[PDB]
Amino acid sequence: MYGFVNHALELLVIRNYGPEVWEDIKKEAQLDEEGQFLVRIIYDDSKTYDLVAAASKVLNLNAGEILQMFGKMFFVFCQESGYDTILRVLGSNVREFLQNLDALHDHLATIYPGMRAPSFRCTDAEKGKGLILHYYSEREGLQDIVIGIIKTVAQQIHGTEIDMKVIQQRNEECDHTQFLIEEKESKEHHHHHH
Numbered sequence: 001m002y003g004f005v006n007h008a009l010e011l012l013v014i015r016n017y018g019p020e021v022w023e024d025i026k027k028e029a030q031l032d033e034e035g036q037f038l039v040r041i042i043y044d045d046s047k048t049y050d051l052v053a054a055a056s057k058v059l060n061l062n063a064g065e066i067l068q069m070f071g072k073m074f075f076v077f078c079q080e081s082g083y084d085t086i087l088r089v090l091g092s093n094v095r096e097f098l099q100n101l102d103a104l105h106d107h108l109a110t111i112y113p114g115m116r117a118p119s120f121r122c123t124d125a126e127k128g129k130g131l132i133l134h135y136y137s138e139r140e141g142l143q144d145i146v147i148g149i150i151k152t153v154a155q156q157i158h159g160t161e162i163d164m165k166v167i168q169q170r171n172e173e174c175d176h177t178q179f180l181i182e183e184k185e186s187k188e189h190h191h192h193h194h
């Protein structure tokens with residue numbers, strides 16, 4: 001886990017709960033000696049999962065909850081910072097966001113060096129209302145992060161209600177985690193009333 005999102009995780013606890021609560025969890029995650037949280041440090045993914053596991057005790061909010069509220073915070077925080085860059089990159093909307101993921105992979109890497117491995121595909125399961133996001137990554141439980149970001153930019157920006165559910169989990173049986181995105185444009189396009 002690169003220090004950017006790792007520091008954003010720290011940020012989540014400090015802001016929404018409190019700095020006092022943060023240091024309590026920091027004790028439990030056995031990360032009392034590690035408070036750098038810088039982008040080039042690259043914290044072990046294990047330390048991130050164990051961190052949220054500790055937060056699941058103190059906050060009582062389970063990993064899935066923390067990861068989703070992380071995505072929510074991440075979006076609103078960036079826009080709150082007043083960075084107009086979020087309005088330019090990723091088209092500032094769900095559709096562009098999804099397909100521009102690999103775009104920031106290269107574009108933002110030129111500014112912040114560091115190996116970023118993107119392996120993902122988006123093919124609908126013969127329905128349209130079911131984009132199968134083929135997510136190839138070892139952090140299978142980091143799925144809720146995607147959920148918390150994508151749904152937020154969808155209905156809040158584009159006004160389109162979409163839901164992403166994990167239909168396949170990376171394990172020994174399957175090297176890939178698959179998501180299904182059910183987009184409801186019938187909420188907007190099917191308003192033939194006046």
Ligand SMILES: O=C(O)CCCCN(CCc1ccccc1OCc1ccc(CCc2ccccc2)cc1)Cc1ccc(C(=O)O)cc1
Binds near residue numbers: 003005039118137139
């Ligand atoms: O496998 C995985 O995790 C994902 C594999 C696909 C690439 N993955 C997309 C995540 C993503 C998925 C869906 C939607 C939006 C997403 O982007 C959210 C996002 C993530 C990170 C930053 C800070 C960037 C930064 C990094 C350093 C300095 C400055 C800026 C910004 C925004 C990016 C990524 C790559 C490697 C690592 C790692 O290795 O930890 C972690 C994440």
